[PDB]
Short mmCIF file of C-alpha atoms and ligand atoms in Angstrom, two decimals:
data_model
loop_
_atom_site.label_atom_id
_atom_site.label_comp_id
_atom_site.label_asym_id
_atom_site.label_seq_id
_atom_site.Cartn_x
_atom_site.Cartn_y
_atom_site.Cartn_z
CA UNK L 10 5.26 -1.61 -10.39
CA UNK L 11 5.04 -1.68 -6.39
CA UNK L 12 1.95 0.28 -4.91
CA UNK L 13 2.36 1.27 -1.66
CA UNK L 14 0.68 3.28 1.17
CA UNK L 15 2.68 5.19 3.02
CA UNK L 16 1.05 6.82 6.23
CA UNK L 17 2.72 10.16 7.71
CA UNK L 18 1.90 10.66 11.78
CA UNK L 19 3.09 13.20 14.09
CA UNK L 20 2.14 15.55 16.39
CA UNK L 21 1.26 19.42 15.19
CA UNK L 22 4.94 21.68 14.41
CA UNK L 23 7.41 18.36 14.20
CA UNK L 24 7.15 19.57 10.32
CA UNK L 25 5.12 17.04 8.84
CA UNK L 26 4.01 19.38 6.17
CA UNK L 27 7.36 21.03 5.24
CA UNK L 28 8.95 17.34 4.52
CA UNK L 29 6.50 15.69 2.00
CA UNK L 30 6.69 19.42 0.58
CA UNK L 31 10.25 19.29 0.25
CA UNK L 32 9.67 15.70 -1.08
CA UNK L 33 7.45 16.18 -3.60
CA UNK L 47 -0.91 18.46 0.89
CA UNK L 48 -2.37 16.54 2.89
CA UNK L 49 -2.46 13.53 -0.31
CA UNK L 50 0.38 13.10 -2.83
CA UNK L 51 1.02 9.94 -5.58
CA UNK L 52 4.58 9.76 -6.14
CA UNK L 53 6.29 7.47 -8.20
CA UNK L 54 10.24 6.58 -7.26
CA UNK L 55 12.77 3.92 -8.99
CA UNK L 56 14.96 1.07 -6.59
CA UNK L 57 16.80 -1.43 -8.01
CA UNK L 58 15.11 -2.11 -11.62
CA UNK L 59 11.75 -1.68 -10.02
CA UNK L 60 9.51 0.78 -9.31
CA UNK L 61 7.32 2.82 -6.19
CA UNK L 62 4.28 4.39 -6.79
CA UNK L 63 3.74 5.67 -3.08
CA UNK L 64 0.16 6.97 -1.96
CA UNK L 65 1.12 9.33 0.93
CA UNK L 66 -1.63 9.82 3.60
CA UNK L 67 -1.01 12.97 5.51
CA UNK L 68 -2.91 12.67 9.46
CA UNK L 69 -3.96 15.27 11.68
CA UNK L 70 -1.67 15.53 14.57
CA UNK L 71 -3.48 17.26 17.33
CA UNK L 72 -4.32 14.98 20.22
CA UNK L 73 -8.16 15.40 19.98
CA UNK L 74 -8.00 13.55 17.04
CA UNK L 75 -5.66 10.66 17.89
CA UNK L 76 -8.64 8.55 18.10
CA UNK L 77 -9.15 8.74 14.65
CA UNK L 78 -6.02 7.91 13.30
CA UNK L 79 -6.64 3.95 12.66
CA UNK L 80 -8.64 4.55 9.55
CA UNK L 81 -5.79 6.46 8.24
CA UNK L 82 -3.27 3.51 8.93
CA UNK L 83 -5.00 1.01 8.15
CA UNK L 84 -3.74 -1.35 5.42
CA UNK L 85 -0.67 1.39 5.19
CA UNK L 86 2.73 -0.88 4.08
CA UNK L 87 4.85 1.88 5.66
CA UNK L 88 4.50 4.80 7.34
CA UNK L 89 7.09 7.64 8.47
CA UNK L 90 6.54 8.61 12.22
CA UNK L 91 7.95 12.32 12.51
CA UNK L 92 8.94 14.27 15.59
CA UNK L 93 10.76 17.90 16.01
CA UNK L 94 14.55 17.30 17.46
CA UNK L 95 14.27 20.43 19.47
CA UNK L 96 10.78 19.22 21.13
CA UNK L 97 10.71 16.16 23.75
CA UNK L 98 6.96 16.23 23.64
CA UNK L 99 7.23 15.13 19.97
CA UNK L 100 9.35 12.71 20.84
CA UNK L 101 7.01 10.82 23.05
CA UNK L 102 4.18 11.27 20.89
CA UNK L 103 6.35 9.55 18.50
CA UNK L 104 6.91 6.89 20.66
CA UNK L 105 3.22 6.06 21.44
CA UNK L 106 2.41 6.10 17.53
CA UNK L 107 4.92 3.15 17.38
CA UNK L 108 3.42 0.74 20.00
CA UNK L 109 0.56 1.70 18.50
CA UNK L 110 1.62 0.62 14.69
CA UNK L 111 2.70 -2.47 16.10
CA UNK L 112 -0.30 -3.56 18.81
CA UNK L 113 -3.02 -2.22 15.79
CA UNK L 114 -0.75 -2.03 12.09
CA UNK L 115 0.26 -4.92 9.98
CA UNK L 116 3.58 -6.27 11.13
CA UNK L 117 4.77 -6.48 7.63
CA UNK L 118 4.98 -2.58 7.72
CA UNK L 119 8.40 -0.51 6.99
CA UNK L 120 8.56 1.94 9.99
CA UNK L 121 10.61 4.64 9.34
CA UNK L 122 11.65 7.31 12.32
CA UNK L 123 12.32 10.96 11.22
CA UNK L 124 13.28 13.13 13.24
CA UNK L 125 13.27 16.41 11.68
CA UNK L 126 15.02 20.17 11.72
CA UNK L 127 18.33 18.96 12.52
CA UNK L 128 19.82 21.86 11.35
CA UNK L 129 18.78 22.99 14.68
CA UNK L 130 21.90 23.30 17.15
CA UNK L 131 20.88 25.38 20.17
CA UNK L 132 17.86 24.21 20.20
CA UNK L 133 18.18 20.74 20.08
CA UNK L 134 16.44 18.25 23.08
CA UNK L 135 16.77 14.98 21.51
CA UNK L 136 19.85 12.59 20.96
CA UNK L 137 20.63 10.72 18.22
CA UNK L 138 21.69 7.55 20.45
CA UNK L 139 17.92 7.90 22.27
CA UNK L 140 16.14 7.71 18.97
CA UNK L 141 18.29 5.22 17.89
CA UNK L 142 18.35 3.17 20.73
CA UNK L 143 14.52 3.08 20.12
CA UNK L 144 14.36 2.73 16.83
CA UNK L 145 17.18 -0.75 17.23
CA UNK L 146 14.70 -2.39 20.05
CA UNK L 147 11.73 -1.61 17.65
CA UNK L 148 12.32 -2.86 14.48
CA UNK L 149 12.14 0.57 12.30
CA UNK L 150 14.87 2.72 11.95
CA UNK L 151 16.12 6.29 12.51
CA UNK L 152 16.94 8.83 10.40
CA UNK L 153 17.55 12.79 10.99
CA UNK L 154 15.96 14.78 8.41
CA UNK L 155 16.20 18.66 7.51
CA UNK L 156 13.25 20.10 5.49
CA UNK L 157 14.70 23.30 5.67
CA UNK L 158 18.22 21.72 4.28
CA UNK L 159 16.65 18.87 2.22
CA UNK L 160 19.21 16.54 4.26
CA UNK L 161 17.79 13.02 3.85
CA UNK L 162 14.37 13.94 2.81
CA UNK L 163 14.65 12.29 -0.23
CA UNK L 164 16.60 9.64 1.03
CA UNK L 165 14.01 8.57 3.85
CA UNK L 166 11.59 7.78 1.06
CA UNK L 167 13.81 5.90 -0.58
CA UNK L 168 14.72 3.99 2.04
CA UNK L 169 11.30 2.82 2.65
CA UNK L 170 11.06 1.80 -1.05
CA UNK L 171 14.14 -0.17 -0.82
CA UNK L 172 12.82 -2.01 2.41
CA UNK L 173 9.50 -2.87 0.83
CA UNK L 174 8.86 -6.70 1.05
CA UNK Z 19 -29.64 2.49 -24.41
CA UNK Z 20 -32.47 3.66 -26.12
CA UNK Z 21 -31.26 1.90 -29.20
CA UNK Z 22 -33.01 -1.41 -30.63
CA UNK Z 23 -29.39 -2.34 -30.85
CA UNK Z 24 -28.58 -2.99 -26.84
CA UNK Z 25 -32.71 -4.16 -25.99
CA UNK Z 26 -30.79 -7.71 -24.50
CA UNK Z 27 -28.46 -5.40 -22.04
CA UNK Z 28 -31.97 -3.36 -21.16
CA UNK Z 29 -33.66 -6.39 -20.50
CA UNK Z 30 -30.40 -7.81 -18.64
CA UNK Z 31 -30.63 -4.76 -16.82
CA UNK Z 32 -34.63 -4.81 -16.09
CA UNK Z 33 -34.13 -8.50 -14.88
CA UNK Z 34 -31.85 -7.49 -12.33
CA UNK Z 35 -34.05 -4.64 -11.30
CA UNK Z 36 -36.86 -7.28 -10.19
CA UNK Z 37 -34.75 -9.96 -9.76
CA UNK Z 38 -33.37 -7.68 -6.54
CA UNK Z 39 -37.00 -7.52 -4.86
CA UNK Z 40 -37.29 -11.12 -4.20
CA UNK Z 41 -34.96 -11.62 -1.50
CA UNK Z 42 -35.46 -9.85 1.82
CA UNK Z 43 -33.66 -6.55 2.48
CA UNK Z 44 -30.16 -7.51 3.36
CA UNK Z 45 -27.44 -4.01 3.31
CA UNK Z 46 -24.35 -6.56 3.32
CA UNK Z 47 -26.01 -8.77 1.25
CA UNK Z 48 -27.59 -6.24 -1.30
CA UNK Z 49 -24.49 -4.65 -1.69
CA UNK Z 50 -22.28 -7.13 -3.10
CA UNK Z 51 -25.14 -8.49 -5.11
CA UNK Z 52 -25.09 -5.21 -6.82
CA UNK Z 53 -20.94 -4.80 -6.96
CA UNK Z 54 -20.88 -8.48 -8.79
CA UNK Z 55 -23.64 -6.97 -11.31
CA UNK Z 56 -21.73 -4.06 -11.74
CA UNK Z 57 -18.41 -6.00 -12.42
CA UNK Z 58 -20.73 -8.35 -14.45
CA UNK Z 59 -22.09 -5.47 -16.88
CA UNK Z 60 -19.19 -3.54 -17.51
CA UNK Z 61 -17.33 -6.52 -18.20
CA UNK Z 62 -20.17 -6.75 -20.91
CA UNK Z 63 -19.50 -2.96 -21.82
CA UNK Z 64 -16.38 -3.79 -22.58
CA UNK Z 65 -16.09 -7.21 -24.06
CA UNK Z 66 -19.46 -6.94 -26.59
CA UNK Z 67 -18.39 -6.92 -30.47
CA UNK Z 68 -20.62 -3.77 -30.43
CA UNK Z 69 -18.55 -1.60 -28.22
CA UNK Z 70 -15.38 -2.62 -29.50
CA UNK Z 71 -15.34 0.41 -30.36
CA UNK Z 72 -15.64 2.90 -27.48
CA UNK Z 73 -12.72 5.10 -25.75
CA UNK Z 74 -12.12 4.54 -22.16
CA UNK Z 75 -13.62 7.50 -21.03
CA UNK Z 76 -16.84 6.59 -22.61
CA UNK Z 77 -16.93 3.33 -20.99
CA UNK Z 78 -16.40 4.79 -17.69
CA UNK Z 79 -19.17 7.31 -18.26
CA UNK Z 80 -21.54 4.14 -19.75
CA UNK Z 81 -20.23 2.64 -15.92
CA UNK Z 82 -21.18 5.68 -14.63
CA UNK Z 83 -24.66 6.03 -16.25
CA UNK Z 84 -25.60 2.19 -15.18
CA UNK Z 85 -24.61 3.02 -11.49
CA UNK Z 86 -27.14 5.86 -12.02
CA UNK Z 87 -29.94 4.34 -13.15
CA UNK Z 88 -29.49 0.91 -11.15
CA UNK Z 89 -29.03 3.13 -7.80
CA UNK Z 90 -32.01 5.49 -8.71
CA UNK Z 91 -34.40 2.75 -9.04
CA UNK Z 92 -33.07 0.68 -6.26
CA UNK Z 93 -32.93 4.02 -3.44
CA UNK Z 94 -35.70 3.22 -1.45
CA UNK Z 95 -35.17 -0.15 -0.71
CA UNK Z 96 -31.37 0.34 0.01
CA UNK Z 97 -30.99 4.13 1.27
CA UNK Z 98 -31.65 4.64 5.10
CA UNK Z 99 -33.69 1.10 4.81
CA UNK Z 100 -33.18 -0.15 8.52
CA UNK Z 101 -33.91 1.00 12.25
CA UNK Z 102 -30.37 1.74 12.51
CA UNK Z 103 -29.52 3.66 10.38
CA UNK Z 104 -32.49 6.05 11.13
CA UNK Z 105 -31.35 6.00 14.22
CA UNK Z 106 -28.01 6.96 13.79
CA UNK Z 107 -28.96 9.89 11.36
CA UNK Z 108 -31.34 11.32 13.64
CA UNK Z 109 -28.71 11.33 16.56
CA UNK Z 110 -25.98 12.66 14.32
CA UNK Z 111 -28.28 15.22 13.15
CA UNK Z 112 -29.54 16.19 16.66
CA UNK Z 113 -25.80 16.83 18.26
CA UNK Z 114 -24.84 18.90 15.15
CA UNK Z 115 -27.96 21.14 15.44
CA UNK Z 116 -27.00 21.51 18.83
CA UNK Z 117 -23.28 22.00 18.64
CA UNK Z 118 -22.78 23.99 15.69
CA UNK Z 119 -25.22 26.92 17.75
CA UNK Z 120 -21.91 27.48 19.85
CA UNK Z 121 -18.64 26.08 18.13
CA UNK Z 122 -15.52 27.86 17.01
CA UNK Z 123 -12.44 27.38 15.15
CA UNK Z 124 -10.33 27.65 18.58
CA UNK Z 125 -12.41 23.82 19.86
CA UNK Z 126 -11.24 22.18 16.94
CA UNK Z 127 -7.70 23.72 17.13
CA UNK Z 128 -7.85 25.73 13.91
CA UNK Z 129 -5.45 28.24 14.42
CA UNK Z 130 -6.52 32.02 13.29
CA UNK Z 131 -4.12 32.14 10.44
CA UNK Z 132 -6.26 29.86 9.04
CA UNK Z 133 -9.56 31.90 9.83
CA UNK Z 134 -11.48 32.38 6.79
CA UNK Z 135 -14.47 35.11 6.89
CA UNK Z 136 -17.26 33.24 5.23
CA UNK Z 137 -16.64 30.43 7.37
CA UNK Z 138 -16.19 28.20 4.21
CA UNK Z 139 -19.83 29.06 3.36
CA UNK Z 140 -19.03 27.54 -0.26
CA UNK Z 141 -17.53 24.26 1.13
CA UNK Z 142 -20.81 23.87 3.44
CA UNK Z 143 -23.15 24.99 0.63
CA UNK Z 144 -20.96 22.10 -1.49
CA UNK Z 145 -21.62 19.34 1.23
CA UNK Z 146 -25.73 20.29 1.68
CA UNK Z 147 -26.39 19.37 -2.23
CA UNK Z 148 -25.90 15.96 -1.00
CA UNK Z 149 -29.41 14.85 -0.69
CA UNK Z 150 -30.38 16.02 -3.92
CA UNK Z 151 -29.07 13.48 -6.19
CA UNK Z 152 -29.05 9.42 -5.89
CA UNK Z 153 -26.26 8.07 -7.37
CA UNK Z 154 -23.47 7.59 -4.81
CA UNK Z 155 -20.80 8.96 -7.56
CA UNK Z 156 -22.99 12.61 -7.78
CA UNK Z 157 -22.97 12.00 -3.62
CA UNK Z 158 -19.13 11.34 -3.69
CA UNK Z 159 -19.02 14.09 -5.89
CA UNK Z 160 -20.93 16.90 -3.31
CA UNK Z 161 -18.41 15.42 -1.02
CA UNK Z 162 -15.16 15.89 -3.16
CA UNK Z 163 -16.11 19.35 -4.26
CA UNK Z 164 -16.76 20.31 -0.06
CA UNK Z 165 -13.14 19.39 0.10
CA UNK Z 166 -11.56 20.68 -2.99
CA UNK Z 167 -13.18 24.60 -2.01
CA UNK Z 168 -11.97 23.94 1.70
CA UNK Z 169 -8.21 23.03 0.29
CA UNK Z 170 -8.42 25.97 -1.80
CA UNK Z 171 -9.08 28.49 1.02
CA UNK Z 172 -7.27 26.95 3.32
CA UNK Z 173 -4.24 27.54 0.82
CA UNK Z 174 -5.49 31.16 0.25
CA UNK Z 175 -5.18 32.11 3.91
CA UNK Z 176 -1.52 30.56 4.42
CA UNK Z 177 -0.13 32.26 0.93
CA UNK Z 178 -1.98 35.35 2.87
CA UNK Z 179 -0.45 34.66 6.32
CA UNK Z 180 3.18 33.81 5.09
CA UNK Z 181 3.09 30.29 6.26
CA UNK Z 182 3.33 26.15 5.15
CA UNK Z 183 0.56 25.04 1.93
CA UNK Z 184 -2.35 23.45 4.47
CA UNK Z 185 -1.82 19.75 5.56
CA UNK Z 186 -4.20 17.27 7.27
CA UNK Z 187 -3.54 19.15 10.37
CA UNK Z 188 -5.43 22.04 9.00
CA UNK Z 189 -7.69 20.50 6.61
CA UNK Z 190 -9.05 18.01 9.00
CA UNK Z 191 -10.51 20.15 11.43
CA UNK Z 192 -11.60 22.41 9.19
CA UNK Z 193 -13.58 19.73 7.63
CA UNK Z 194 -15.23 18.30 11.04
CA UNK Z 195 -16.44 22.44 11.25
CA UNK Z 196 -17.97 22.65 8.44
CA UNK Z 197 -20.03 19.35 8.64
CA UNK Z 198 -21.27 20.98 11.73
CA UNK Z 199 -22.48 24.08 10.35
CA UNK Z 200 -23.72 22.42 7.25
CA UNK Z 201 -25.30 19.49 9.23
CA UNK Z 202 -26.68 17.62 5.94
CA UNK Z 203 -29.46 15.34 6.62
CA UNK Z 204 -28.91 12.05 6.74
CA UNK Z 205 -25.14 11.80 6.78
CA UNK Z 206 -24.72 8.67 8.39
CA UNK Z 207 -26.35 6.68 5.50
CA UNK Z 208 -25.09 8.99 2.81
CA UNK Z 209 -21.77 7.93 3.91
CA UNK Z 210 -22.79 4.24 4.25
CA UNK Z 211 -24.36 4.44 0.54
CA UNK Z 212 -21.13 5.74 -0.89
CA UNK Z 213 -19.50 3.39 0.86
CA UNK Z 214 -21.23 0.39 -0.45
CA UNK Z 215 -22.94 1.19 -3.38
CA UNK Z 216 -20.22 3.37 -5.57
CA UNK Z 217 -18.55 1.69 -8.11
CA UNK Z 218 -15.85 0.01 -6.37
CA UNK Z 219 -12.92 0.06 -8.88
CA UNK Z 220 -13.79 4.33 -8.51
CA UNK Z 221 -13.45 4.50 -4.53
CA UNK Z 222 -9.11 4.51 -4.65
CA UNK Z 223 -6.81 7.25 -4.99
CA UNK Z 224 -7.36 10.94 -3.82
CA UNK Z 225 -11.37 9.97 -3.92
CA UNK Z 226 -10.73 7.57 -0.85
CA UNK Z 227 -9.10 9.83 0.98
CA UNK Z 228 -11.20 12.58 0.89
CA UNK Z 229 -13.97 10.02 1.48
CA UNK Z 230 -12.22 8.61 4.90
CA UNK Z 231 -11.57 12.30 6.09
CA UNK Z 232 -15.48 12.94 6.22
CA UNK Z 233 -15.93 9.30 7.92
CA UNK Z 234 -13.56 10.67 10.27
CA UNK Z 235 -15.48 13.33 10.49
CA UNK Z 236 -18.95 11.92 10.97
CA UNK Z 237 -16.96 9.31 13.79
CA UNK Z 238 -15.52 12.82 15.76
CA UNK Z 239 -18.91 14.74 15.35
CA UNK Z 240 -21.01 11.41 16.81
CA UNK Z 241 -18.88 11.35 19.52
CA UNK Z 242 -18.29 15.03 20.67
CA UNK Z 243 -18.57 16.04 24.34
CA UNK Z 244 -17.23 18.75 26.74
CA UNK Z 245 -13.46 17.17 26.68
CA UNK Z 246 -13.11 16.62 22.77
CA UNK Z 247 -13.88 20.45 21.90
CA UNK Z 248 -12.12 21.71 24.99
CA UNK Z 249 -14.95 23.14 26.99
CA UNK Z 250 -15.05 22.82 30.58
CA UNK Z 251 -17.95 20.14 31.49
CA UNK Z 252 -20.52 22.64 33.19
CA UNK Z 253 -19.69 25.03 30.15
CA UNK Z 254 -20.42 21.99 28.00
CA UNK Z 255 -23.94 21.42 29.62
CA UNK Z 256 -24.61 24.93 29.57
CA UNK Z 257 -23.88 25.18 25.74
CA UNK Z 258 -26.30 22.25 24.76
CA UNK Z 259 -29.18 23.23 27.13
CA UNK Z 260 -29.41 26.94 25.15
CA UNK Z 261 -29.08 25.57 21.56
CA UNK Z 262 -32.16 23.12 22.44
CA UNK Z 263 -33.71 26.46 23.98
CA UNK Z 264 -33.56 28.04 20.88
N1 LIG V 301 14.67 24.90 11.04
C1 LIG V 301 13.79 24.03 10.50
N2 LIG V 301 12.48 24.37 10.51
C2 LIG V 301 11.54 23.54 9.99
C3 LIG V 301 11.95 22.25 9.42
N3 LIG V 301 10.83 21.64 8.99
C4 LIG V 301 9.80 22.47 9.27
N4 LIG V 301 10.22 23.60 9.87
C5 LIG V 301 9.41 24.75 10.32
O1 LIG V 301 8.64 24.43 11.48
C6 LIG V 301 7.35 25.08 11.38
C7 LIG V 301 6.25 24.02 11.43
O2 LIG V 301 6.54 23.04 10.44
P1 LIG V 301 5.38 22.26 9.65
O3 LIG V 301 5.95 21.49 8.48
O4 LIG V 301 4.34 23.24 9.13
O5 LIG V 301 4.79 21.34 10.83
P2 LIG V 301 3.55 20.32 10.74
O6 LIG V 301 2.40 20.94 11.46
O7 LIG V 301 3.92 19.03 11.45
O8 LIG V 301 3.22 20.00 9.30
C8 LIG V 301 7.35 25.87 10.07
O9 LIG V 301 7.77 27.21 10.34
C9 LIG V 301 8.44 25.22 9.24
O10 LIG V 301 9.03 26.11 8.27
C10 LIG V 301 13.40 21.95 9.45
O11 LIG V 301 13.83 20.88 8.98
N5 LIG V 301 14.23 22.86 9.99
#
């Protein structure tokens, strides 16, 4: 019923990759159910090295969500994650579901970046947060969902 | 179309063929003059008591076969046709036969579990066959198949290396390298063609994204210095002043 681009961004090793894999490539159709409607997303994989940020716009563009990923155990990620979200909102649609993932929370010893930070963002910013485990499938599927059910 | 049954879509077809000369050369213009024909005659594929009839597959190849033959006769005048776009071919073509002299996989951050040993010779090979057909869907086509080989070796050397089925991160730069080393003429106004002259119902899906990875591509190569394939400025310099060399 709904079609819907959904744009993923992150920088290289936040695990990108291993999530729409768990999900479900750098491209993916996949087709969900909400509420006696339906999702068809189009997921738009990006490259996430910095040499290429440049060219990330013609990815987003016309995107009506997009998940913003960063790696828990990696602060680095974090603020890259950060800069794609001014970004989204100086240069994306506003009418775009943001979602925040912040991925390999299994992770416990290794683990650089709070909950309340990300969500603290995430509140003043309009999107919100969720942790994610590829590894675990925690809220992988979920995450997706969520976007579909917060599709105007 | 041979047929003495569909003369009055041949002659609808001719018309349009002449019909196109009399205005001046317009790209913007020309191009959604030919969309609305397009729309206009398959439309008339479909609707005609004639075809009632066909399958959907044969009226997307009849859609097909009318881009073909429209495109074909209507090359010249819309292919490369401006100052521009000679321009920017002939600068996109001059940095790639300089740059793709001295390039690696390490500039573009392809990491060496990635490495394949023919340098995706195939995927290059795939790309270069784009200037021997006219129709922006067998151009699309050279395009989609560069890509397809590339995701196929690229998944080859991670089931080989133990490691994640290739994203964007990998196929991405892996694309902008072998553009480089393929360096097909005219790429700026192949991609421009495409762009405005393929059936526009057909550019969505997978095809579109494929299609924006090698405008991403073209946009990265256009605009590569010392900095964006991390070699030290005077390195840089020294590179580009032995490719022209040789
Ligand atoms: N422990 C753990 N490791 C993960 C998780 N997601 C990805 N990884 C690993 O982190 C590494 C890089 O992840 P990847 O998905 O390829 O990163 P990408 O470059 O952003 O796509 C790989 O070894 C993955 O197996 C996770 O949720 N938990």
């Amino acid at each position: 019923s709904i079609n819907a681009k959904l744009v993923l961004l992150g920088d290289v090793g936040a695990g990108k990759s291993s999530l729409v894999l768990r999900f479900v490539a750098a491209f993916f159709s996949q087709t969900l159910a909400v509420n006696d409607a339906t999702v068809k997303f189009e997921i738009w994989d990006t490259a996430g090295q910095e040499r290429y940020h440049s060219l990330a716009p013609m990815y987003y563009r016309g995107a009506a969500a997009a998940i913003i990923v960063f790696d828990v155990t990696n602060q680095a990620s974090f603020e890259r994650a950060k800069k794609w979200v001014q970004e989204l909102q100086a240069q994306g649609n506003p009418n775009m579901v943001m979602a925040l993932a912040g991925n390999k929370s299994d992770l416990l010893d290794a683990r650089k970046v709070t909950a309340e930070d990300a969500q603290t963002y995430a509140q003043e910013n309009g999107l919100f947060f969720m942790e994610t485990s590829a590894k675990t499938a925690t809220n992988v599927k979920e995450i997706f969902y969520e976007i579909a059910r917060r599709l105007p | 179309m041979r047929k003495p049954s569909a003369g009055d879509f041949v002659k609808s077809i001719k018309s349009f063929i002449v019909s196109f000369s009399n205005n001046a050369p317009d790209p913007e213009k020309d191009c959604a003059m030919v969309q609305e024909f397009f729309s206009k005659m398959e439309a008339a594929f479909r609707a005609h008591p004639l075809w009632s009839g066909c399958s959907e597959e044969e009226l997307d190849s009849a859609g097909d076969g009318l881009e073909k033959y429209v495109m074909t006769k209507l090359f010249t005048r819309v292919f490369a046709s401006n100052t521009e776009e000679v321009i920017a071919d002939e600068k996109l073509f001059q940095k790639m036969s300089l740059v793709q002299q001295f390039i690696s996989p390490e500039n573009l951050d392809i990491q060496p579990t990635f490495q394949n040993e023919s340098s995706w010779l195939l995927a290059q090979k795939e790309l270069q066959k784009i200037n021997m057909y006219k129709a922006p869907r067998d151009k699309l086509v050279c395009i989609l198949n560069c890509c397809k080989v590339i995701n196929n070796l690229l998944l080859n050397a991670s089931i080989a290396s133990n490691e994640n089925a290739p994203g964007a991160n990998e196929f991405l730069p892996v694309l902008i390298y072998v553009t480089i080393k393929a360096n097909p003429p005219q790429l700026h106004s192949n991609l421009l063609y495409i762009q405005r002259y393929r059936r526009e119902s057909k550019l969505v899906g997978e095809a579109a994204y494929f299609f924006t990875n090698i405008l991403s591509a073209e946009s990265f190569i256009s605009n590569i210095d010392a900095k964006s394939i991390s070699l030290d400025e005077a390195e840089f310099e020294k590179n580009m002043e032995s490719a022209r060399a040789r």
